Amino acid sequence: GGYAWEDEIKRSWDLVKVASLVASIVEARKKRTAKKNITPYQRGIIRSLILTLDCSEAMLEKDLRPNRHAMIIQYAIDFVHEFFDQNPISQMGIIIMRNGLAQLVSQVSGNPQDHIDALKSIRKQEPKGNPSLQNALEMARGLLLPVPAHCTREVLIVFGSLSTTDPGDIHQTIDSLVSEKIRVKVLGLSAQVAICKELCKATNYGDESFYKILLDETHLKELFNEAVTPLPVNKINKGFTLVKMGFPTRIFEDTPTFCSCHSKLVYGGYFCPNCHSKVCSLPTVCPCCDLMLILSTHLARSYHHLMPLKTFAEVPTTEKFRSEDCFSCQSRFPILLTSSRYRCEDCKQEFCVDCDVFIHEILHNCPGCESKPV
Amino acid sequence: PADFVPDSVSGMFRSHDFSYLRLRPDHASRPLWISPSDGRIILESFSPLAEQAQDFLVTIAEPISRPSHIHEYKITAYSLYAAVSVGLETDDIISVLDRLSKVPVAESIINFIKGATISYGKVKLVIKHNRYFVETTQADILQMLLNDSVIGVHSFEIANESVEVVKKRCQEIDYPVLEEYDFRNDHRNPDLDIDLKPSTQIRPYQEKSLSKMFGNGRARSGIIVLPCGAGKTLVGITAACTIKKSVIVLCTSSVSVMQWRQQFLQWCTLQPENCAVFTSDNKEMFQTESGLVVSTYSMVANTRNRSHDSQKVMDFLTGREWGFIILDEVHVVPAAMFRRVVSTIAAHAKLGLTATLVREDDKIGDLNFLIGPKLYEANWMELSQKGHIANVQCAEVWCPMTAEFYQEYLRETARKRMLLYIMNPTKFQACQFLIQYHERRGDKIIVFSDNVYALQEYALKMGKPFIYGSTPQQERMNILQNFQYNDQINTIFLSKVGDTSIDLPEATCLIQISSHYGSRRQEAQRLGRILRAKRRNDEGFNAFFYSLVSKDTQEMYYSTKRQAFLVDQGYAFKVITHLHGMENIPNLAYASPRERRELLQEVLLKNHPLIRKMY
Ligand SMILES: Nc1ncnc2c1ncn2[C@@H]1O[C@H](COP(=O)(O)OP(=O)(O)O)[C@@H](O)[C@H]1O
Ligand code: BEF
Numbered sequence: 001g002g003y004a005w006e007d008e009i010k011r012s013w014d015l016v017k018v019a020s021l022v023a024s025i026v027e028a029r030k031k032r033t034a035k036k037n038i039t040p041y042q043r044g045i046i047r048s049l050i051l052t053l054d055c056s057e058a059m060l061e062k063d064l065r066p067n068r069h070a071m072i073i074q075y076a077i078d079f080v081h082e083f084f085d086q087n088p089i090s091q092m093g094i095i096i097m098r099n100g101l102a103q104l105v106s107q108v109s110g111n112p113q114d115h116i117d118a119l120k121s122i123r124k125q126e127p128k129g130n131p132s133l134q135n136a137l138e139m140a141r142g143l144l145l146p147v148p149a150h151c152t153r154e155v156l157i158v159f160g161s162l163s164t165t166d167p168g169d170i171h172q173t174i175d176s177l178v179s180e181k182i183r184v185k186v187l188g189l190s191a192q193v194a195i196c197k198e199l200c201k202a203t204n205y206g207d208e209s210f211y212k213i214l215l216d217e218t219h220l221k222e223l224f225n226e227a228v229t230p231l232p233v234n235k236i237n238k239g240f241t242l243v244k245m246g247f248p249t250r251i252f253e254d255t256p257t258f259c260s261c262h263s264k265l266v267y268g269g270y271f272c273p274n275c276h277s278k279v280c281s282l283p284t285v286c287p288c289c290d291l292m293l294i295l296s297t298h299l300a301r302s303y304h305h306l307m308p309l310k311t312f313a314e315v316p317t318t319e320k321f322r323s324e325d326c327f328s329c330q331s332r333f334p335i336l337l338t339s340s341r342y343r344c345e346d347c348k349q350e351f352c353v354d355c356d357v358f359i360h361e362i363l364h365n366c367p368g369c370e371s372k373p374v
Numbered sequence: 375p376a377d378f379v380p381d382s383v384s385g386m387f388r389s390h391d392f393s394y395l396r397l398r399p400d401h402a403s404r405p406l407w408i409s410p411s412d413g414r415i416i417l418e419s420f421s422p423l424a425e426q427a428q429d430f431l432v433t434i435a436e437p438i439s440r441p442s443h444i445h446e447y448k449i450t451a452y453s454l455y456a457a458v459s460v461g462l463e464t465d466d467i468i469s470v471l472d473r474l475s476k477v478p479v480a481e482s483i484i485n486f487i488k489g490a491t492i493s494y495g496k497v498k499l500v501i502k503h504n505r506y507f508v509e510t511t512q513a514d515i516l517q518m519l520l521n522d523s524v525i526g527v528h529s530f531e532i533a534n535e536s537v538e539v540v541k542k543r544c545q546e547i548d549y550p551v552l553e554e555y556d557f558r559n560d561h562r563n564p565d566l567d568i569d570l571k572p573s574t575q576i577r578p579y580q581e582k583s584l585s586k587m588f589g590n591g592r593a594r595s596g597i598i599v600l601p602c603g604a605g606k607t608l609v610g611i612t613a614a615c616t617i618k619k620s621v622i623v624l625c626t627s628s629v630s631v632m633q634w635r636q637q638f639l640q641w642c643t644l645q646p647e648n649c650a651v652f653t654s655d656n657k658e659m660f661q662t663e664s665g666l667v668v669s670t671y672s673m674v675a676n677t678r679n680r681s682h683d684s685q686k687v688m689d690f691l692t693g694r695e696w697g698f699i700i701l702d703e704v705h706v707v708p709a710a711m712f713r714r715v716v717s718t719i720a721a722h723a724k725l726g727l728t729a730t731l732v733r734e735d736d737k738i739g740d741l742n743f744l745i746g747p748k749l750y751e752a753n754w755m756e757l758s759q760k761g762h763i764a765n766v767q768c769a770e771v772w773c774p775m776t777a778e779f780y781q782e783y784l785r786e787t788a789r790k791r792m793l794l795y796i797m798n799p800t801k802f803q804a805c806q807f808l809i810q811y812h813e814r815r816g817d818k819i820i821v822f823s824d825n826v827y828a829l830q831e832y833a834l835k836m837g838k839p840f841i842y843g844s845t846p847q848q849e850r851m852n853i854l855q856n857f858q859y860n861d862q863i864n865t866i867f868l869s870k871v872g873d874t875s876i877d878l879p880e881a882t883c884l885i886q887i888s889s890h891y892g893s894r895r896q897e898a899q900r901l902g903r904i905l906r907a908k909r910r911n912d913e914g915f916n917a918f919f920y921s922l923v924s925k926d927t928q929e930m931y932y933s934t935k936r937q938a939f940l941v942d943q944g945y946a947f948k949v950i951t952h953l954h955g956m957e958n959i960p961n962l963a964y965a966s967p968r969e970r971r972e973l974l975q976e977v978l979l980k981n982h983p984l985i986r987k988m989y
């Protein structure tokens with residue numbers, strides 16, 4: 001019955017004792033394979049999202065620095081800034097779950113600043129109580145009722161608890177959501193929840209990829225970011241129509257004038273082309289004729305979602321190459337036996353690794369393709 | 375050093391320029407720098423393999439200083455003797471040293487390791503029926519030992535009193551002796567069946583310390599150094615529990631005798647029947663086959679005057695052949711007569727347990743042959759960050775003496791000079807203000823003062839309890855219990871009596887108005903009292919350790935010298951020139967000049983049945 005002391009000494013120093021360039025590429029080659037599958041899927045550019053955040057006792061855990069509540073709210077502020085930047089003509093609503101009740105903190109509106117203020121205020125209150133998905137879903141269902149049929153009704157839920165207390169039958173609410181064509185995305189924190197999986201599956205035409213559980217703080221930012229892009233529409237769900245909106249013309253007046261939206265004096269504003277009323281900022285629904293007012297820039301922000309740039313396929317080192325320098329940035333390609341050239345099939349022009357990421361992430365037009373004359 | 379051009383700045387380095395060697399391309403990974411001449415080692419604590427070499431380096435090289443970032447180690451002959459004991463040969467050390475050293479191990483360093491690494495393992499000292507035999511595994515040693523001018527498979531007897539001489543002779547001669555006990559194969563000595571109860575928990579650093587002692591499977595004799603509050607009591611208990619033989623514990627205090635026994639009963643499963651305490655109160659000895667004796671060095675080191683009650687105990691101790699001895703606070707064993715207990719008491723294994731392994735005189739190194747080499751040393755900072763010991767915000771408050779008192783300071787002789795600046799009015803204000811401030815915060819304050827007269831003066835005016843040598847055990851215990859379990863009393867005034875081996879879990883704050891000259895261990899041991907804080911894991915907790923020192927006095931010379939051990943461990947002292955908010959305090963001691971002058975004069979003036987009915 002001897003103890004571990006008498007056996008031997010650990011001898012930690014014994015543990016430690018004293019192609020690579022190809023490895024760095026094959027990983028790049030494999031990663032390009034994942035993104036090679038890109039098709040012009042139809043997407044609903046006009047969105048109506050109801051952001052539901054969990055603020056309960058389970059959100060007081062110390063898993064995420066400093067705590068789940070602070071980080072989720074902190075990421076929520078980031079989400080609003082990114083969402084409206086890439087979805088200018090969409091609207092957002094914010095709900096929170098506290099004391100087994102759903103609390104409205106932001107009405108559906110197209111003004112990003114209003115949502116930011118509400119989120120910042122929520123950052124102070126200490127979360128407590130039990131969550132209630134049914135209360136949140138019912139409130140989200142009501143908030144999305146006064147929305148046009150051409151918009152995409154979506155609900156993003158950040159769930160942190162493993163249990164839910166509801167006053168009624170959750171399955172009935174799930175059935176109502178499907179009838180109302182609302183789409184629900186759930187970002188869990190700890191583990192899968194049976195009701196959440198059913199909600200995400202039955203509500204998304206059986207797809208099970210809309211219920212995501214993070215594995216670290218780095219992944220959580222990726223999960224939040226992925227929700228900014230518009231969600232592809234289902235084939236059998238047809239709501240095609242024409243929406244009447246106008247393009248106002250900016251003015252520059254010498255004296256201040258009252259705004260028809262806030263009844264506040266503002267120097268400059270955009271004049272509606274249907275009733276001549278002035279609005280401080282865009283894009284917003286005109287306060288008089290209920291006609292959406294937007295600029296041409298807002299529409300152009302969503303063209304890349306309808307005509308995605310086809311992926312760039314690697315070029316094997318067996319074949320010869322056209323030029324020693326990048327077409328767009330003329331960055332000399334290191335010789336390294338492997339190649340770093342990325343070619344666009346449409347124009348067959350070599351691109352460096354740096355541009356390829358930039359062209360497909362910041363820009364949305366291939367420099368070579370535009371230069372090429374038909 | 376061949377064909378190396380000196381630099382223009384080489385003159386600044388007086389023969390210490392070690393740039394003659396070159397650096398390999400793998401310097402980014404190797405975490406060890408080695409001085410080719412002094413043997414110094416500079417270790418990077420922020421590089422890979424730091425934990426890989428943190429234990430290997432400690433075994434071979436003793437630590438001179440281990441501050442936050444850059445650790446400093448030195449290789450010495452005594453350090454190597456400890457390393458060679460635990461299954462280490464020159465080839466292994468050389469191979470690992472080269473594998474980890476940024477700079478090549480110089481021939482001088484190679485020569486040093488070769489000489490001291492080959493002698494170990496050729497002479498053993500065994501004990502049989504209280505008879506000491508210097509046994510050797512080879513016959514060649516007889517021509518070297520029996521012919522020694524000092525002395526007097528082959529085995530020959532040696533006088534018990536001569537052990538203290540032959541062991542030094544063994545160090546002087548090429549072969550040093552090793553004390554290894556094969557408790558597994560030892561059946562003659564009766565065993566003691568005791569095991570740690572399930573409630574016990576073994577901390578990793580203690581587990582490492584035990585492993586270093588039971589590496590080869592045979593109990594070693596040496597010293598275990600752990601920071602105050604690390605749990606050395608359990609380390610001794612575990613060693614006693616695993617050996618399962620007759621044991622004894624020696625401590626240089628009376629109150630600590632109960633503490634060790636109290637910890638012994640609760641941690642292990644020894645029955646009260648086999649435990650006997652040999653102190654001034656009770657002297658009964660266990661008559662059972664085997665047991666434990668928790669005594670003090672004073673009782674066992676006495677030689678001249680032993681009474682009948684104690685004489686019988688002495689015969690019982692000497693007659694029987696014991697197996698283990700535990701020396702708590704082993705930093706006082708090599709004294710003139712405390713070291714006699716090691717030789718007089720027969721034991722096959724000896725363990726030393728001291729938080730501080732330093733002393734004013736050069737007799738500290740003598741511990742190598744009194745009890746054995748140093749087995750394991752635990753870094754104070756590493757345990758502190760792991761939540762095992764509390765963190766301390768050491769501070770040094772400068773209290774400038776008033777002009778009136780300082781006028782007599784210059785003229786007064788040194789002997790009375792101490793008493794002059796120990797009761798300066800400024801220090802009273804600092805001590806009172808600090809005590810009140812920490813009392814408001816809700817801190818248990820311990821005030822240390824070596825000078826008994828100053829201790830009494832502080833307590834009498836401040837109306838707080840004080841403890842000093844003359845107080846009895848009952849009264850001091852009553853004061854100690856009140857200071858712990860009662861909210862009314864939160865501060866006590868202790869003296870040199872409680873400087874070592876006293877457990878005060880509730881103590882968090884410490885103040886030292888004046889203390890024992892240049893002694894360093896006193897500063898560290900006293901600091902250990904507040905390292906015992908029970909609430910050492912709550913967020914934001916920082917124990918407070920103050921040292922009030924009079925400016926422009928010899929106390930500064932003593933103060934900077936006595937805290938030279940804590941700085942080596944890693945603790946840094948902060949200078950506090952002034953305490954904010956101290957003037958707004960309602961009342962202060964000796965505020966008016968009249969009171970100050972009254973103190974000055976008093977301290978200066980200090981130096982037939984029939985006849986019975988008549989009456
Ligand atoms: N492993 C452990 N489990 C529980 N308490 C421990 C442990 N190690 C140390 N302690 C506690 O640390 C304190 C100091 O123990 P002690 O052995 O007197 O320390 P040292 O002799 O090193 O100053 C006591 O409260 C003791 O119970
Ligand atoms: F080292 Be301890 F405080 F006995």
Ligand SMILES: [Mg+2]
Nearest residue numbers: 606607702875
């Ligand atoms: Mg102790």
Ligand SMILES: [Zn+2]
Nearest residue numbers: 259261262280
């Ligand atoms: Zn307005």
Ligand SMILES: [Zn+2]
Nearest residue numbers: 272275286289
């Ligand atoms: Zn209008």
Ligand SMILES: [Zn+2]
Nearest residue numbers: 326329352355
């Ligand atoms: Zn490029």
Ligand SMILES: [Zn+2]
Nearest residue numbers: 344347366369
């Ligand atoms: Zn192209």
